[PDB]
């Protein structure tokens with residue numbers, strides 16, 4: 486004649502209960518006859534009893550700064566049992582919203598990292614990383630690395646293989662991300678890796694050679710940064726692409742009428758670094774393309790070739806610059822992720 490026993494995922498009088506998980510009640514030596522949970526305003530939280538009557542769980546996300554009262558009743562062959570539990574959830578000092586790139590359903594190149602950018606500084610980087618679940622198919626190992634206080638990146642050791650599915654579940658709602666900062670919401674994104682496209686700009690030849698799945702499909706002469714403002718070597722990730730884009734140097738503090746000033750509407754511009762390196766149309770430098778470097782760091786190419794590049798590259802394709810007189814693109818540029826050695830990237834910078 487055992488009385489039914491009830492087990493809850495919460496404790497009476499608990500405080501700071503995180504809302505990153507549903508609340509459940511389980512019955513033994515009997516079944517749940519009724520389970521209810523209401524907040525301080527009397528409003529119930531949606532839940533569902535399992536078909537066998539042994540498990541009840543909330544199906545609606547709980548809220549912050551709330552007081553919940555949980556009531557459960559179990560009936561068994563041996564009698565009846567009831568419990569009442571009250572608890573209070575986390576009271577964030579501030580919330581932060583995550584933003585994920587690339588976009589959901591996108592087809593990206595083999596260089597595209599997963600990016601999760603928050604709208605606030607993240608004090609507990611480890612908590613953030615733990616709340617982000619990455620699925621890859623075919624599965625490959627990857628690791629997180631922070632570009633700054635708000636944006637973390639995830640990538641494998643080598644370029645993605647085409648045909649790879651990437652699933653990104655940012656499960657930050659209810660997660661304490663440090664110093665009272667909690668996740669404002671969850672985000673779900675999924676994308677796929679398309680064709681391997683790798684363009685190599687070699688300063689020795691001043692040719693930009695585009696290889697699609699290992700085959701050279703296009704060669705175009707280029708003029709890169711002049712010796713005083715050279716184009717950094719390294720691996721660049723293709724970012725945004727513009728049919729045309731207005732650029733004004735005074736926007737960033739450089740007068741237009743200075744030696745390094747400019748104010749023009751640029752055609753067929755493909756971004757390959759946050760620092761400002763673009764592939765774009767440079768009709769004025771057609772003669773120097775393939776012979777001498779004349780730009781401020783951009784890879785200048787012909788109008789038809791710049792349009793060709795715009796048409797044939799996608800977000801996440803790779804541009805690799807070699808043999809310039811400049812240094813190496815910073816790994817934390819924003820599109821320079823691949824320039825960090827794997828051992829450093831894997832080790833991370835969570836602490």
Ligand SMILES: */C(C(=O)Nc1ccc(OC)cn1)=C(\Cl)S(=O)(=O)Cc1ccccc1Cl
Pocket residue numbers: 732747748749751761762763765767770779780781782783784785
């Ligand atoms: C790239 C760049 O270096 N463009 C460039 C500078 C100078 C010359 O003279 C031959 C040719 N191309 C960029 Cl993103 S920029 O910051 O310098 C803006 C700019 C300025 C002039 C022309 C095009 C562009 Cl995108």
Ligand SMILES: [Cl-]
Pocket residue numbers: 760761762763781782783
């Ligand atoms: Cl630049």
Ligand SMILES: [Cl-]
Pocket residue numbers: 732760761
């Ligand atoms: Cl720029």
Ligand code: NA
Pocket residue numbers: 525550551552573
């Ligand atoms: Na309360």
